[PDB]
Amino acid sequence: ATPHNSAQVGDFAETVLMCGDPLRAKLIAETYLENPKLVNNVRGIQGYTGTYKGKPISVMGHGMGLPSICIYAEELYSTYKVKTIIRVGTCGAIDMDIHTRDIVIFTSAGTNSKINRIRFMDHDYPATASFDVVCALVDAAKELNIPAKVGKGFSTDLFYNPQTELAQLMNKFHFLAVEMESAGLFPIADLYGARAGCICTVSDHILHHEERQNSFQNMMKIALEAAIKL
């Protein structure tokens, strides 16, 4: 149906969970979904559709970086009529009070990318997670009573950032963690009147040197439950 998706309208649930690693999406589909069916594997993206507690739910990879997720997200909302996209994955901690294995729920994401300025007449577009999704994720976390930090994330275009002072600058402003897609996902959802959100498990701290499964499983519980609530 699209240059990056062989599936047809209806093959995807209205709620899709996405992570960068296609093998993680495969794992997620085999571990948490019932009767997972491979609906798209163009570029080995591992797009599946199954059910969770009886409700349709899809999981698919989105690659690394804003340009990548921008391709997948826009096609999902536009062609497959998806309504909600929840980004699930790992991230690097920025804030000194954020530790490895911590779970973070993004209220929004800053970025050093030019994509949003291109879409917003060179002005400041606040890549903001859909309030419904942020609420669904936080309520799920509260109901499951799983500690989670809510706040700003940063989507960098440079995993290996030349601007070494940026890290401390973000710490001063209390950005929670760094990843590479949220800032791109959020504005696309707005344009399509759809919804998006993001939750990550800190797998490393960029300001200093500091089991990882429990944290990842807890994050998945939150995303899945929130998905049902939505």
Add this chain to the structure above:
Amino acid sequence: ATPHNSAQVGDFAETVLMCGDPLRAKLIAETYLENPKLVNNVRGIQGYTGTYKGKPISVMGHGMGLPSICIYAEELYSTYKVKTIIRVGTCGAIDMDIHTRDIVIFTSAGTNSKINRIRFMDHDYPATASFDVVCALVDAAKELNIPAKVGKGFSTDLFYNPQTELAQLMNKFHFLAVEMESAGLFPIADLYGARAGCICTVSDHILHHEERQNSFQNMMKIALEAAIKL
């Protein structure tokens, strides 16, 4: 104590409500606060401190524009040790589904100002309302059962915008309304590890032509109650 505030540390409550119009802040202090005392009137800013349901609460004007509120907000957090600043006021509707008299709670604010790029190494800083404040405002609205729209706002540097296409662009991305301070307030709160939020009553629609007291009073109820919850 500061170039724009004659008050001394302790004269202001840890929670301050702010609006652009100094006469509105005076009105608010005389109408909703008990035993309001003028604590600062440099530049006729009308800074008062009284109590609401027994709790200390201050109200003060902040002028129009990011540069103005940036002066007042930074001094309040830094010198007067204020913890929470809730911006209350009017705004212009952008989204076609947003109507005059509607109450809007900002999740974040975009801007055409250069201030955040100056503070954030020329990158995209998501001027995000503190999640605690957004929640306090929304819960108050739910408890008072007062319809309110939650979403993105836009803080313009140009009330009379030369870029006439921006209005429709923001409508496509579903920005709710336009004002002139939020985008400046939010990042300052982050820097001081403090909190900030914003709630406005739509007093006009910028995309077409379309009582105003009830809406303003309801907005004040929400802000005041949320202030107590915080």
Add this chain to the structure above:
Amino acid sequence: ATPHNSAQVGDFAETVLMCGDPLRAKLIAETYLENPKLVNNVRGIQGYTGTYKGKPISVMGHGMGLPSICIYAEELYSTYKVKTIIRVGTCGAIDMDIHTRDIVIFTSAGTNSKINRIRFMDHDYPATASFDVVCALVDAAKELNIPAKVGKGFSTDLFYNPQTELAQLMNKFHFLAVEMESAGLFPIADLYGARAGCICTVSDHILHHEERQNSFQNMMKIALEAAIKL
């Protein structure tokens, strides 16, 4: 007549003196104008109209920052058919040869704001004081034989500037002082084929630590006389 002005066309003189502090404008009106009449007090802006040496002259506040003065100035030229706006006020010295209490007449103003780039297709617009006004102010100063420095000013969006190196950079280029409106005022006057200028009394030096009435009164004499000459 406008969202920020209750006065009607004709209530304002063709020449208006403006300062940030509304209480200063009130003081100016009661101290230097004959039969001052309050013509506008929306947002407590203190807009008056009286006479000086028999000629009509208005004085009104304009708040702090380019966005604020941009609102007031554009409405004055456009709706109230004002012809000349002379900004009078205080400023911070930059140049090491400029001292506190010195009077400065702006030839132009630089800025770290994005407003002029928005109006000028992202290019460099030289916020220049109207040559007639600069001349009127300088001749008045010469005739009153009051020492005054003529040169570049800087209109910052950030009173509390994070970029601490900017101060010395401006000293190297010999910017005289810093304020927060001139750079916004000047281009608006050009657009309306009207005139604008600015004169300030240095109330503090930003590069080091260093009666204030005489300087302020002398500055007012210059502005008033120049107003008559125009």
Add this chain to the structure above:
Amino acid sequence: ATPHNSAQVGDFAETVLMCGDPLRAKLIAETYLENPKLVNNVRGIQGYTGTYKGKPISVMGHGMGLPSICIYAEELYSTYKVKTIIRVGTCGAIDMDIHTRDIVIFTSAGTNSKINRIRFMDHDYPATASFDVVCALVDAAKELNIPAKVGKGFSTDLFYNPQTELAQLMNKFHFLAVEMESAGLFPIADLYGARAGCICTVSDHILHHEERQNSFQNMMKIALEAAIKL
């Protein structure tokens, strides 16, 4: 050894061919390499190392977008001591004289990304293919007598570009085709004193509507032979 590569120094040849699609890299390894061994499959990237005409050669996916390839390329040069990276893949034609199935060899690549400005103090960095690689690709094409167009490419951050006028602008300047990695690859090679180049087969035209295997196989012949020449 790295967050995205499980292989160890020595597992990769000094010359690596890369394409966005991991399944294409798998296909390439099974079709053109002798004794291909999977050396890295983190995130299903399909990194292989085999031999072509007796010489060591690796093939691996790099995902879509500058941020993605920037991660893989920098790790290859820095950690695995790779010397040459030749990007092989598909692209969209821009120039009206460029047709679908045409083979294009990039001399350089323009971009709407902010990555190079971040690495180059906000100036214009010419993402240029290594002259040795451009020559090796062109000589191979000449020796194999396979028609190929040499010229500028464009690496977009937005596959679905909102700026619809850009396409015709690039046509006027004669950009040959569009892809999403070259502009990111080239500067990284320069920084590591290494080499990089790109060759693509046009799979579609963005300015109008206009077998695909022959073109892809011919492109692979050129890349492989050039790899040997280097």
Add this chain to the structure above:
Amino acid sequence: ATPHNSAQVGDFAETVLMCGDPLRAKLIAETYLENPKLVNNVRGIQGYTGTYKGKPISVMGHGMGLPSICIYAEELYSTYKVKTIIRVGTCGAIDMDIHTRDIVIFTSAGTNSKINRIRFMDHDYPATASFDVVCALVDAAKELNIPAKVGKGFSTDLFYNPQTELAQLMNKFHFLAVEMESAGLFPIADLYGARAGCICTVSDHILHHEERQNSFQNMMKIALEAAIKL
């Protein structure tokens, strides 16, 4: 002494008149100066030094564009200890009320160049003519009773401007004329605590189609006399 000047300190007068055309500078030296001596001809720049009414005065070409004049001006202030540089030449009219053959005295100059942003931490630097020079030029014009328009000029990097809407934009803001050096000259003078100014004779109108000697001679009279006054 410098890469572009063979003269030695002292060969140039403290006041130098400059124009783009080296042949015009030669003409000026032979027509208005007494005992003109060629002091520099590197790159055929035609740098002369003679006397006018007994006072030392130099005339030299400066090429076309900000980068060119920036080279010559900085060397003159820095190495040859020049104090005043008055740019004399031709320009294109912008304002509809400005006609061919009109003489224009620049108060300042806007630009689409990046040079000033590079020198001014990416902010808006107002390329302003030295007030002493502007005054000297205007007084000379008044004393010689030669009609001259005083106002903003624009220094473009593109004589053949692709942005065809800029012309009308500048007309709306009342820029008087266009040339290619002033915006570069002015900031350099500031840095060296020296002085600079510009006066031009409109040789063509860019907004419509509309003897040239008288205008040029009158402009030279103004510059020369002003030079003496300084």
Add this chain to the structure above:
Amino acid sequence: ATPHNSAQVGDFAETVLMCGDPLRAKLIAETYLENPKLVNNVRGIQGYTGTYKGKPISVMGHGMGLPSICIYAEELYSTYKVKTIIRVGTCGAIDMDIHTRDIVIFTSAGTNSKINRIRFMDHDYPATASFDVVCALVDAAKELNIPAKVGKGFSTDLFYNPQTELAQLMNKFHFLAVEMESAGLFPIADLYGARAGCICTVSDHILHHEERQNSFQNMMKIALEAAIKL
């Protein structure tokens, strides 16, 4: 025929060699061309047309800086129907492995100018030398067996660069040398479907302190021979 060229269509050969110094172009015409005829001397630009090995060839100055060469190059392609422009001249070495007297052939040129962003919707345009010209220059060098380095150049707007860190940054990325026109020349050739290239002899090193005729003559041999090959 044009504001900067008195010659008429046909007076210039389809291949023009250009250098900044007009006296160097005169020297080149008298030293390497047979029967050189002055075809244009507006602004003393020294435009000649003669023959080399029986083929028509023109040589003309282009001044210093992108704005200057942009004027001359665009008029040559557009009005005089020139097909190839080869920039010949001197440059400053950047790379530590590049030494004075070395000959450099530009593959492309980076720049700190805003011209290309203005022509390319504020994106990154890779100022790339025409591949035919780069090849002609390199083959000539190989056939004449004259050592020459091929790589990136940088066209600065500031000969006296305030950003002193840029030099080392470019060294890290291996820019070969610095000049002031290439980045402007290349994009203009693309727009006119014509060709351009550049070759320079390093006359100085900007990173340290380190006969000059042989190098200049060898560079001229390469340019001339390449001109014939084209």
